[PDB]
Amino acid sequence: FVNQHLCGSHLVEALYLVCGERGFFYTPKT
Amino acid sequence: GIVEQCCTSICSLYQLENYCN
């Protein structure tokens, strides 16, 4: 599910699944 | 940043993990 174009909620979903309990930061303007 | 690498271009696990805490 990671090796494709991921935009919007689809990208934050991928971050959520990959990063697990570590969590993540989503900075679309940076 | 993440949008350029993963939305505009094709994403990768390597890149996603750069945004994990």
Swiss-Prot record, chain A:
Effect of residue 24 to S: In HPRI; Los-Angeles
Name this protein carries in UniProt: Insulin B chain
Species in which this protein is naturally found: Homo sapiens (Human)
Residues of the full protein shown: 25 to 54 of 110
Swiss-Prot record, chain B:
Disulfide bonds: 6-11
Top-level taxon of origin: Eukaryota
Protein known as: Insulin A chain
Annotated organism of origin: Homo sapiens (Human)
